[model samples]
Target: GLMQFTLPVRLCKEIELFHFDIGPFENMWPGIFVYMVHRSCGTSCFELEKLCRFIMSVKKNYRRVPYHNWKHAVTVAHCMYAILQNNHTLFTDLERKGLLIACLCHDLDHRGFSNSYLQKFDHPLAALYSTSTMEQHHFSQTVSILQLEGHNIFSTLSSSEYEQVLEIIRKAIIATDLALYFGNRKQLEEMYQTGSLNLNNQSHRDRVIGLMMTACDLCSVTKLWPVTKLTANDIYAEFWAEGDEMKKLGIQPIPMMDRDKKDEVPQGQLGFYNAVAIPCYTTLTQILPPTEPLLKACRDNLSQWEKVIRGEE
Candidate 1:
């Protein structure tokens, strides 16, 4: 990608959706971002912010798409706040702050399209990191940043705080894209059906973090009206753009979402929901009502999509 990501995200910038109250320059680095996490978390903020900063600085050798940029980070922060509220777990001021910071900064320097492109081109990331969800080089960067002298986010944490924050950040970020909603949903269903949330007094801290983070990532699901529609459009447009790039390169376009045809997307998402999301969230809400609305939105969206496919615009 380009040198540094000091640039505001394109769509977010177009919509003028910068973090008006909290500029990146205003980021507390190891302070504000971490503190925010500390305040919102079941975990510590120190390590989370450390992870956040590293993610923001990473780059893959591809067109850095704006969708996978800072705007997405900010959105995740917002969603994280909402999820914490839904959870009834009152994070300490520091924990809350840290959670927000972690969510906002997790994907820091995303390079737009999926890592598959980079891998196909034998991009350094593909060679070094392998084919995966988020780039492994990116993961290594997170590790490197934490290992920095006098700079580890968990450096100042008490032993317990260090362990907790590390666990939280690890779970939250890993859950992101690697475990698709359907997979998570399937696991949740298995738990509910068998009454076997069998963490066996072991605590599913990471698993929960993953689900919660995934919820934050898809916050647009329950978004009110127009912006929700916009978020949906944004997802499709990104795919279409990728399809376009593939076409120019004489590669067979990824199927089900060529973007060349004017077909609306977020439909593939329907299968995603049908196979995974809807069932999982629906089961989740019976034990957690705060998630009910989110569950309902999935259904409502699917119904509307069915109409859209029938050419009902």
Candidate 2:
């Protein structure tokens, strides 16, 4: 059994309103995630202990890649926690649990490569799940871990409830794919425009949960300045490593993954914040307005990157 750790003052403090950059301590993620889930779900002591052990197990399973490691997982879960705190009344007990757990397990067993990278290299995971390759693998890994002897934290749920939670988790994890996020973003924007965002509707809530996963997955863009830049560096390093691997296989890497374009990081991120991050958060905060700061900070980062592109930063 993994030893249970105590939550820190920096984390156990009151829920966040907007800023997520303060909790620089990513190592305490297991304790933090457990505590938040405890508050949200009122899980039993047995469940709590088992959940903590499961988190430790999940953490150990993560590879020590540049950005897709345990720390990133913790950060994503932390983002989920912050959002839940802000919108606690918005989702039901079950929906909150699903979202939090999905965030916690969304990037399990990541190998520092994109789905396209995996498919190009003919990785086994690519063949296993032909579509949304990495996301599917991550979800499978989550389910596999949950099926382990002591790791079935959801074992207390009835068969039907368990199946529903698992299905929600599956959808939420698959939604992390940027490929799906484009469609989800459009759906969300249309809902916001038409004022048809019915949270009570199952389809509407599922769509919101999917987009929430996207917002949290890319929450680093909304982090504080130095932290956000550092995260960008870490991700680019991972991307460059993929480029190196592709070169070894005689495959041309995408520009985002290519090391030769290292100098383009500023402009690349600028474009990403504009085309992807900004619009994403803008459409998101339309309903969950407390999340507007995400769009605000991302736009600020865009300005800073614009300066860097012009040699003014």
Clashes of each: 21, 0
| TM-score of candidate 1 against the unseen true structure | 0.70
lDDT of each: 0.55, 0.82
Quote the lDDT for 167 in model 2. 92
Best candidate (score: lDDT): 2
Q: Give me the runs in candidate 1 sitting further than 4 Å from their true place.
A: 1-64, 90-99, 131-138, 141-155, 178-181, 198-200, 264-269, 310-312
Pairs that collide in candidate 2 are none
Global local distance difference test of model 1 = 0.55
By summed lDDT, the worst window of 10 consecutive residues in model 1 runs over: 14-23
Tens-place lDDT digits, model 1, residues 190-220:
7667777644333443444556666667656
Q: Each candidate's TM vs. the true structure?
A: 0.70, 0.92
Per-residue lDDT of 16-124 in model 2, one digit per residue for the tens?
5344553556555666777667666565533666787788888988998999988888778777877777776887766677778888889999999999889889998
